[PDB]
Amino acid sequence: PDVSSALDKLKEFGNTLEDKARELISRIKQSELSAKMREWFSETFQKVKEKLKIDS
Amino acid sequence: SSALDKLKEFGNTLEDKARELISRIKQSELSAKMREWFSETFQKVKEKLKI
């Protein structure tokens, strides 16, 4: 058996998990930006419609 | 934007569990290396002392 190789494997895993978890956070923030901009485009076009409509 | 802000807490949770895991692996490592070392030392002492 290889107790030393097993532990080193887990440190490797542990260290990657910690770095990828940080990267997950950034992908969430990207979709957040996406979702918020979709909300903003719709809202603002809604306003445009209304403003023209109440002016023919 | 609910699914996002609490998914962020998810990232933070994974990050903390990662660190914790590493801390624990290192402690296991120290423990095993001390166990091997003590055992080897005792063994050599035994041999030099003819039981």
Author numbering:
A (entry chain B): 2 to 57
B (entry chain A): 5 to 55
Which text from the study accompanies this structure?
The dimer from crystal Monocl-1, once known, was simply placed in the unit cell of Monocl-2 with the same coordinates; the two helices in the dimer were rigid body-refined and then subjected to restrained refinement. Although the movement of the two monomers within the dimer toward one another is slight, it significantly increases the interactions between them. The buried surface area is enlarged an additional 7% to 4,050 Å2 and becomes 22% of the entire surface area (19,021 Å2) of the entire dimer. Monocl-2 represents the dimer exhibiting the greatest degree of compression of the constituent monomer helices. As in Monocl-1, the hydrophobic stack interaction at one end of the dimer is fully maintained, but the opposite end of the dimer shows the two monomers pressed more closely together. In Monocl-2, the hydrophilic interactions appear a bit more certain and involve Arg39A-Ser27B, Ser43A/Glu47A-Arg 23B, and Lys 50-Glu19B/Asn16B/Asp20B. In the less hydrated (34% solvent) Monocl-1 crystals, and the even less hydrated (25% solvent) Monocl-2 crystals, dimers are so closely packed, molecule A against B of translationally related dimers, that the sheet or band is extremely dense. Although the band seen in Monocl-2 likely represents the compression limit (the monomers can get no closer to one another), it is not certain that the bands found in Monocl-3 are necessarily the limit of maximum expansion.
